[PDB]
């Protein structure tokens, strides 16, 4: 409802922010030229959520990623996300002591 | 369209008498500029306008930044002039697959030379070559005597700044008149003589719905009092005026001599003549100010504690 | 082949004015609008100034901005600075399918 | 000035016409000319507008593959080109000179208007005319004055005039206008008052004159012997 | 395209004639101004009115014009003898990219004493039997084109076939003439008694047949 884009945005820890891609309620998608061929966001319109796919992840890829709402196709980001941190590291989770 | 017009001589056509949906116009991620001045894109499905003009020409890439209000250049000088105040905005695309020709298109004409700066609005056709000097310019095309249109060099393999960019120019109007253009909003069920919030036409108030006997002239909309209120409402769907009842209209002043000191108040009514109050209650005066209730009232005349009007004063004792 | 370039980092001293300067690498800047994001650390980025020189709800009047075709260049000016104000800065425009940032 | 332009033309139905505006007593200068065709019995249709500094052109959406127009600045003459002829193409073509003005509508207007070319189809080929002899019968002929004339019969193109002794004639002369028929043939009348003394005395005959045809036959006309 | 006028309209010298023209939104309503352009019968039109309140010099200043809303209106204070001519409302239109005209309003101011039609019929003489044709006319005179009939019966049948009607042309007494031809066969020419051409004219026939043998 409301034919609201909802899109994605991260930025690298002391870095600038990067767009990546955004979506309509219908399955239209735009996505940054940069980084195309490897994204995919879909719709679930039954959970009330949008999700990205993201393949062959690179170390540069450690950001912070958000999600915002858009008002207006080429509007403002008007309410965001909290900040999830998502780090590209080959080990696993261990247990603190 | 299948064609645009050249630059001095726009095609504008009236838009009227339909719900503009705007979510087809900026949603369509294909165009290039949608810097609109004054009221908001977003805004645009709410607001309703008097009528809607669109402009339409093309322009190169170069010329596509100068039709904002307050530019110069040879284009909002002496092509198309915006006024300051300007209410819509272009929308400008490229046109590559269309109007790009090899060899170049030189059916467009834009004004590169005027004898004086366009007033907003204004379309000016006109081929009398324009001369510089001195020299009398009877219909000749000699030294410093130039045709006033120029043409325009459109190629496939042309300059970014120079490519032909299809531009189309909306612009509002809000004109003392029904809206015979609105966004596509719907509209509910009329309730009367009840205290309900409206939004009639874009107009949005609170108060209650009552039937006025007041005839209404066609040509105006909205009815003003003195107080510069809304006070008539034509109502497209039906077409009857109805009176708008404020919910709170009269003059309400509560003496409260406190929180924590007491939690006894007294109500003074202005516009009544000591019923349309709060309550009854007792102990009900009425001076020159008005009716004031939850207040006594003594024959003794001691020092103005708390000042109610035209020499009364009341204050809280035993 | 659009992109938004603004300085680095810019300090001024509290009680004066200071211009924080976004400019364009090829198209302009006249046009599908500006953005203007505050980003305190450990935080997500709100918006500060949107559209031309438009403001939200919740920020003070101090952000002022505007608009610069000439000089290719978008300006946020902000009077009588802060402690508050201590954070990163972005500007934000629309390009064809695309989102670019700084 | 005066826009003057060529005479009337009679072209085949599927070819090609060249038609041309000449300006007379001045050019021109740097005035935008138009074209506008008129249908016998129907309103102006606007053709394309032509500004000869620049040489460009455009036309009406009707009609694009069609029409060719141009122009010359240098000699002042500006031409049409109307291919592929069908039999709704028959009308009076003009040349307007369209003249402009500053404002908020600013609608162009076509001041100076050409004289008119008629341009016409017609499948039938020109044919020598037939002049038929009419006289009054007896019976016809019952006051004073007797009503003799000519007819002519398979005749084309429309303009042809027919005189009266080689104009020896001038009162009691009728032109009628001839009509269209199922096979595209045109045939005219004419009929004189004279009188009944005279039809002994002096004779009438017919001088019909075919420009295109090259031809130019004399015919007599005598009184009925049966009746 | 879409400039529509009445087809007809009427007056008189003494009073005062309005010719509408409306259109559509993107024609009159947009803005564009009307142009009028008067349309003699036997000449080209010339340009009446431009910017719909501007006269050409040579133009008498009764023709008067206006716009308003997505209408125009011309008016002629007085209407003289040379007033009968066809006007065309001209504007600009936006989907066609193009200049448009009216439809034509056919103004005509006129009135004269009509008498009663006389008709004459010619027959056929004997030196077109040899050409296998019969050119059958029928002379018509002093008649109105308001009423024109032409019908040819031979007292068994009426002919259907080869009958045409004409316009009538001014003569030089301000009077209308005009002549209808029938194409028939010399075969089947002697094997009918009877070609009578009927014309009737308000009410009033006149017949007359002629008697070829």
């Not at chain 2, 056709?125 to 060099?153: K, M, R």
């Not at chain 4, 000519?150 to 104009?167: I, Q």
Request: aromatic share 10%; net charge neutral.
């Amino acid at each position: 409802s409301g034919g609201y884009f909802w899109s994605w945005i991260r930025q690298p820890p002391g870095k600038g922010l990067e767009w990546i891609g955004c979506i309509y309620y219908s399955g239209s998608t735009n996505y940054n030229p940069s980084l195309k061929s490897r994204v995919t966001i879909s719709v679930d319109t039954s959970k009330d959520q949008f999700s990205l796919k993201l393949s062959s992840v690179t170390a540069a890829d450690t950001a912070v990623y958000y999600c915002a709402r858009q008002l207006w196709l080429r509007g403002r980001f008007d309410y965001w996300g909290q900040g999830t941190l998502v780090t590209v590291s080959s080990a696993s989770t261990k247990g603190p002591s | 369209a299948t064609r645009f017009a050249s630059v001095y001589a726009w095609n504008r056509k009236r838009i009227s008498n339909c719900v503009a949906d705007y979510s087809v116009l900026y949603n369509s991620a294909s165009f290039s500029t949608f810097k609109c001045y004054g009221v908001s894109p977003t805004k645009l499905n709410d607001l309703c306008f008097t009528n809607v003009y669109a402009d339409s020409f093309v322009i190169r890439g170069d010329e596509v930044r100068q039709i904002a209000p307050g530019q110069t250049g040879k284009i909002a000088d002496y092509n198309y002039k915006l006024p300051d105040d300007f209410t819509g905005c272009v929308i400008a695309w490229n046109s590559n697959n269309l109007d790009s020709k090899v060899g170049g298109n030189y059916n467009y004409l834009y004004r590169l030379f005027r004898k004086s700066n366009l007033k907003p609005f204004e379309r000016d056709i006109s081929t009398e070559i324009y001369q510089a000097g001195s020299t009398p310019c009877n219909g000749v095309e000699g030294f410093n005597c130039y045709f006033p249109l120029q043409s325009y060099g459109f190629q496939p393999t042309n300059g970014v700044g120079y490519q032909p960019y299809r531009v189309v120019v909306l612009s509002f109007e809000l004109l003392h008149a029904p809206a015979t253009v609105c966004g596509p909003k719907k509209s509910t069920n009329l309730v009367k003589n009840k205290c309900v919030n409206f939004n009639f036409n874009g107009l949005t108030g609170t108060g209650v719905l009552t039937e006025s006997n007041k005839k209404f002239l066609p040509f105006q909309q909205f009815g003003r009092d003195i107080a510069d209120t809304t006070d008539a409402v034509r109502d497209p769907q039906t077409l009857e005026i109805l009176d708008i009842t404020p919910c709170s209209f009269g003059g309400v002043s509560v003496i409260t001599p406190g929180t924590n000191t007491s939690n006894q108040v007294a109500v003074l009514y202005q516009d009544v003549n000591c019923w349309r109050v709060y309550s009854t209650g007792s102990n009900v005066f009425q001076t020159r100010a008005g009716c004031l209730i939850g207040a006594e009232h003594v024959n003794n005349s001691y020092e103005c504690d708390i000042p109610i009007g035209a020499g009364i004063c009341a204050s809280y004792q035993t | 082949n659009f992109m938004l370039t603004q300085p680095h980092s810019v300090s001024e001293s509290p009680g004066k004015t200071v211009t924080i300067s976004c400019t364009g690498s090829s198209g302009s800047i006249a046009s599908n609008y500006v953005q203007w994001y505050q980003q305190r650390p450990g935080s997500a980025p709100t918006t500060v100034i949107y559209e031309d020189n438009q403001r939200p709800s919740g920020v003070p009047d101090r952000f002022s901005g505007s608009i610069d075709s000439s000089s290719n260049s978008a300006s946020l000016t902000i009077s009588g600075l802060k402690t508050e104000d201590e954070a990163d800065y972005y500007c934000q425009s629309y390009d064809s399918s695309n989102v670019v940032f700084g | 000035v005066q826009l003057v332009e060529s005479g009337a033309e009679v072209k085949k139905p599927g070819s090609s016409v060249k038609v041309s505006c000449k300006a007379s007593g001045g050019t021109f200068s740097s005035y935008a000319i138009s074209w506008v065709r008129q249908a016998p019995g129907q309103g102006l249709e606007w053709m394309g507008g032509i500004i000869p500094i620049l040489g460009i052109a455009n036309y009406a959406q009707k009609f694009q593959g069609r029409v060719t127009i141009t122009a010359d600045k240098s000699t002042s003459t500006a031409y049409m080109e109307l291919s592929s002829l069908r039999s709704e193409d028959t009308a009076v073509y003009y040349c307007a000179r369209e003249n402009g003005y500053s404002g908020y509508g600013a609608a162009a207007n076509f001041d100076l208007w050409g004289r008119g070319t008629l341009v016409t189809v017609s499948s039938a080929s020109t044919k020598g005319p037939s002049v038929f002899p009419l006289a009054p019968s007896s019976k016809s002929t019952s006051g004073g004055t007797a009503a003799l004339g000519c007819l002519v019969k398979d005749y084309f193109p429309e303009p042809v005039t027919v005189s009266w002794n080689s104009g020896a004639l001038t009162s009691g002369v009728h032109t009628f206008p001839a009509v269209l028929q199922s096979s595209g043939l045109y045939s005219l009348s004419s009929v004189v008052t004279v009188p009944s003394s005279s039809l002994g005395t002096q004779t009438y005959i017919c001088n019909v004159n075919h420009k295109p045809s090259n031809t130019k036959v004399d015919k007599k006309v005598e009184p009925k012997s049966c009746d | 395209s879409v400039l529509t006028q009445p087809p007809s309209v009427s007056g008189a010298p003494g009073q005062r004639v309005t010719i509408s023209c409306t259109g559509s939104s993107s024609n009159i309503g947009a803005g564009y101004d009307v142009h009028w352009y008067q349309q003699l019968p036997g000449t080209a039109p010339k340009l009446l009115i431009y910017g719909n309140s501007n006269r050409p010099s040579g133009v008498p200043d009764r023709f008067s014009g206006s716009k308003s809303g997505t209408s125009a209106s011309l008016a002629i204070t007085g209407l003289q003898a040379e007033d009968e001519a066809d006007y065309y409302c001209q504007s600009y239109d936006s989907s066609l990219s193009g200049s448009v005209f009216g439809g034509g309003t056919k103004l005509t101011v006129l009135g004269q004493p009509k008498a009663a039609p006389s008709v004459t019929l010619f027959p056929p003489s004997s030196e077109e039997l040899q050409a296998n044709k019969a050119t059958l006319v029928c002379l018509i005179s002093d008649f109105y084109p308001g009423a024109v009939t032409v019908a040819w019966k031979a007292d068994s049948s009426p002919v259907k076939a080869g009958v045409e009607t004409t316009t009538p042309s001014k003569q030089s007494n301000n009077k209308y003439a005009a002549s209808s031809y029938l194409s028939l066969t010399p075969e089947q020419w002697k094997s009918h008694r009877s070609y009578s051409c009927q014309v009737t004219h308000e009410g009033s026939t006149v017949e007359k047949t002629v008697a070829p043998t």
